[PDB]
Amino acid sequence: GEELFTGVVPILVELDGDVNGHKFSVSGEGEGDATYGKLTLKFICTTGKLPVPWPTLVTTFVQCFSRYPDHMKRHDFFKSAMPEGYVQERTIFFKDDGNYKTRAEVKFEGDTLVNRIELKGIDFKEDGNILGHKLEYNYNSHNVYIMADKQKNGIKVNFKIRHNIEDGSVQLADHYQQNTPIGDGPVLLPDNHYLSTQGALSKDPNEKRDHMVLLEFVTAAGITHGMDE
C-alpha cells in the first residue's frame, strides 16, 4: 500500500448521518499527496443545511495520506492496509454534551481513495454548543496518538479536539478510535507514535450550498529506532 501513494491520489468522501433524528448527507471531493501529507477537499451537504457545525465533522471526513518520514515508513499502518482498505470506527464524546458513534470504510475504489461513512449522534442538547451551532469555523493544530492492537490486527487511537466556542471557551471532543483491515492480508502494526496536524477551514465564495473547504497537513512523528511487531 505504500507504493499506491507516491503521487496525487483523488478522493471521494460520502457521509450519511443521523443526529438526534436529524437525517443528513454530505459529499466530499478532492486530492491527497501523501509525499507531503497534503489534503485538500471540498464538502457539500446534499440535504440542505448541515445540522451539526462543520468543525465537528472534520475528523470524521483518510489518514493513509499522513506524511511518514522514511525512518518511520514501516510504522505506517494506514497505507499498509491498502488497496483492500481499512474499517475505521470512532466514538466521539463532546464534554457536557452528546456523542457521535461512527463507522467508515476507507479503501481504494478504482484509482480513487474513498471514505464511506455512517454516523449516529445522541443525547445532544438543543440549547447546545453543537445543535445550537455555537462553535467558531476553524481548524487548530492537534496531535494524534496511535498504538498497535495485535488482537484486532490494527490500531487503537485517541486524541482530544479543542473546538473554539464562539463565546470563547473550549468544547472538547474525545475521539476513541479503532482501525482494522477489511484487508484479509497482512498490515504493519506500529510501535506507539503520534501524528501532527495543520489545517484550515474556509469557503468557496461561488458555492451556493452549505459546504466546507479543508486544506490539511499531517506528519507522523515520535519514533527514532528500528521497526516492526
Side-chain angles (χ1 to χ4, degrees), residues 120-125 127-133 135-149 153-155 157-164:
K120 172 113 249 279
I122 36 106
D123 287 314
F124 286 99
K125 304 165 161 61
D127 266 10
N129 281 326
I130 322 311
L131 283 170
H133 287 269
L135 303 178
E136 298 170 39
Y137 185 73
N138 50 45
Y139 186 127
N140 292 302
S141 196
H142 289 87
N143 283 299
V144 173
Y145 296 101
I146 302 163
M147 47 147 105
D149 179 355
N153 193 29
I155 62 185
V157 167
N158 183 53
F159 53 93
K160 290 133 183 78
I161 301 294
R162 314 169 315 258
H163 288 288
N164 303 295

Side-chain angles (χ1 to χ4, degrees), residues 79-83 85-97:
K79 296 189 187 52
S80 84
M82 296 290 170
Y86 61 77
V87 183
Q88 173 161 318
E89 294 154 307
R90 258 212 200 93
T91 302
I92 299 170
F93 306 85
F94 294 80
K95 193 166 171 163
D96 341 312
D97 210 323

